[PDB]
Amino acid sequence: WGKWVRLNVGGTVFLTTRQTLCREQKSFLSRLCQGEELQSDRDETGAYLIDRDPTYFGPILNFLRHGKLVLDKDMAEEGVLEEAEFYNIGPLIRIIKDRMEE
């Protein structure tokens, strides 16, 4: 093993590090790459399998990188929210919600 981790999210593979995923100790991702997830399934390439849409995963992963929420203009904020709720990142869910009143 190493510091690098591959996540197969709905058929698309994302490359990142343990440091990035484990910024939120109670998140699904930190729990995943620490082997504390019961359903830890991996393909032959060693990538973690996630039955979620990869379209809205980029922003989630970027928040874990630089702490900010950045969206392109055409991307639905509702889609990112559903993912943030699934991966259980509190701070991000809040920021998204706070962005959806005005």
Residue numbers in the entry: 29 to 130
Please quote the paper that reports this structure:
The human KCTD family contains 25 soluble proteins that share a conserved potassium (K+) Channel Tetramerization Domain (a subtype of ‘BTB domain’) at their N-termini and have variable C-termini. The BTB fold of the Kv and KCTD families has a roughly pyramidal wedge shape and consists of five α-helices and a single β-sheet made from three β-strands. Here, we present novel X-ray crystal structures of the BTB domains of a further five members of the KCTD family and examine the stoichiometry and stability of their multimeric assemblies in solution. Overall, the pyramidal wedge shape of the KCTD family BTB domain creates a versatile scaffold compatible with a range of oligomeric assemblies and geometries that may impact function.
KCTD17 regulates ciliogenesis by polyubiquitylating trichoplein and its missense mutation is associated with autosomal-dominant myoclonus-dystonia. For instance, the closed pentameric assembly previously observed for KCTD5 was also found in the KCTD17 structure. We also observed higher-order packing in the crystal lattice of the His6-KCTD17 structure resulting in dodecamerization of the core pentameric ring. This assembly establishes an extraordinary T = 1 icosahedral protein shell comprising 60 monomers that enclose a large water-filled cavity. The C-termini of the monomers are pointed outwards from the external surface of the spherical body, making the construct amenable for multivalent display by C-terminal fusion of desired sequences. Overall, the BTB domains displayed a range of affinities from low-to-high nanomolar: KCTD17 (Kd = 7 nM) > KCTD5 (Kd = 55 nM) > SHKBP1 (Kd = 87 nM) > KCTD13 (Kd = 100 nM), KCTD10 (Kd = 460 nM). As expected, the complex of KCTD17 and Cul3 was found to run on SEC with a radius of hydration consistent with the formation of a 5 : 5 KCTD to Cul3 heterodecameric assembly. Analysis of the SAXS data revealed that the scattering curve fit well to that of a structural model built by superposition of each KCTD17 BTB subunit with a homologous BTB domain from the structure of the KLHL11-Cul3 complex. This model placed the Cul3 subunits at the interface between two BTB subunits increasing the overall interaction surface. Homology modelling based on the conservation between KCTD17 and the KLHL11-Cul3 structure suggests that the close proximity of a neighbouring BTB domain in the KCTD17 pentamer can provide an additional Cul3-binding interface that may substitute for the lack of a 3-box.
